Symmetry: C2
Subunit: 57 residues, 2 copies
């Protein structure tokens, strides 16, 4: 796809990566409730990233 | 609230902000299906930010 489409796809990938950074940080804090929501948030970011990749890849 | 707590809260805030930015890019692209998943992702990141906020302060 177009450069704008590629920038969007890159941003979806960066967000998916950042959820794992935050997951590890919440694990270090032993913040279990929040780590759980962040695990699901990584799954949701992956859903977006895959949808973007299928369309803009 | 400790440095690590503050790093985690700010990271949750950043992820919420980046998903808002990505949703606007996806809207500019008129990529409907992707914008819809991103809207749901943005709300999920808000939940994480608010969950961190209610726990950590």
């Amino acid at each position: 796809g177009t450069k704008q489409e590629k920038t969007a796809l890159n941003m979806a990938r960066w967000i998916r990566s950042q959820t794992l950074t935050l997951l590890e940080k919440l694990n270090e804090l032993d913040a279990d409730e929040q780590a759980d929501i962040c695990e699901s948030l990584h799954d949701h970011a992956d859903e977006l990233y895959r949808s973007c990749l299928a369309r803009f890849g």
